[PDB]
Scaffold this active site. Structure first.
Site, mmCIF file in Angstrom:
data_model
loop_
_atom_site.group_PDB
_atom_site.id
_atom_site.type_symbol
_atom_site.label_atom_id
_atom_site.label_comp_id
_atom_site.label_asym_id
_atom_site.label_seq_id
_atom_site.Cartn_x
_atom_site.Cartn_y
_atom_site.Cartn_z
ATOM 1 N N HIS B 28 12.323 -1.662 23.848
ATOM 2 C CA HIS B 28 12.755 -0.611 22.932
ATOM 3 C C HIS B 28 12.404 -0.959 21.493
ATOM 4 C CE1 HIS B 28 15.906 0.641 20.003
ATOM 5 N NE2 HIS B 28 15.524 1.833 20.424
ATOM 6 N N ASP B 50 12.045 0.061 29.234
ATOM 7 C CA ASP B 50 11.543 -0.808 28.181
ATOM 8 C C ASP B 50 11.549 -2.253 28.652
ATOM 9 O OD1 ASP B 50 11.430 1.516 26.684
ATOM 10 O OD2 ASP B 50 13.400 1.177 25.774
ATOM 11 N N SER B 102 19.938 -6.080 20.038
ATOM 12 C CA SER B 102 19.425 -5.396 21.219
ATOM 13 C C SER B 102 19.042 -6.394 22.301
ATOM 14 C CB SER B 102 18.214 -4.536 20.845
ATOM 15 O OG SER B 102 17.190 -5.324 20.270
#
EC number: 3.4.21.90
Lengths: 48, 151
Positions: B28, B50, B102
């Site tokens: 991502h 992703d 993330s």
């Protein structure tokens, strides 16, 4: 010299045969591919 | 365990983590992956997925154990304490689960990474997340609660 039409109406039986063949083949392949696209998509739409 | 931050501009922007069976990188976000062994691996990203393809030599293959069905509500060890919920993502404390971190795996207490977070910044006075895991029968499906942004 005498009364004739000549209005593109000379497409012969073999001519019409070939033309309908090619048109149908193109239509069939494109429609099958279109169907397969949503066939792939609906699986993912079902995974959740 | 090999969980690695992603190097962008010389600071952490993501967090790549290798999983059982296949090596994983959250695609991502971008940034050069810190690990040199991963620095020479082709990328395999789907339209919504992703994830990096697993191209580590099979010496360190399957660093973790994947997660099966039958989600208990019990404790799952998270980077910031345990998490306890079953219907959806755990009601993480406010302030925690913000942004910039993330690619963080949530693991079972038994060493089985239940899911992978892919956002879910805030969900109210509590907070759940948008994650991906097996659906019911082992299907890599993502669930995104409304108001989900990468964390």
């Amino acid at each position: 010299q005498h009364t004739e039409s000549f209005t593109s109406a000379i497409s012969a039986t073999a001519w019409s045969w070939i033309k309908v063949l090619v048109g149908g083949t193109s239509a069939f392949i494109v429609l099958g591919l279109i169907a397969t696209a949503v066939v792939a998509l609906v699986l993912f739409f079902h995974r959740h | 365990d090999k969980t690695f931050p992603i190097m962008l501009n010389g600071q952490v922007n993501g967090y790549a983590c290798v999983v059982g069976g296949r090596v994983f990188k959250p695609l991502h976000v971008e940034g050069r992956i810190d690990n040199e062994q991963l620095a020479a691996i082709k990328l395999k990203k789907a339209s919504i997925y992703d994830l990096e393809y697993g191209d580590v030599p099979q010496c360190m293959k399957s660093d973790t154990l994947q997660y099966t069905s039958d989600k208990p509500p019990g404790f799952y060890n998270w980077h910031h304490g345990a998490v306890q919920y079953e219907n959806n993502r755990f009601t993480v404390p406010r302030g925690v689960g913000g942004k910039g971190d993330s690619g963080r795996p949530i693991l079972d207490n038994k060493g089985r990474v239940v899911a992978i977070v892919l956002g879910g910044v805030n969900e109210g006075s509590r907070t759940a997340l948008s994650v991906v895991t097996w659906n019911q029968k082992g299907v890599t499906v993502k669930d995104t609660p409304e108001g989900s942004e990468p964390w």
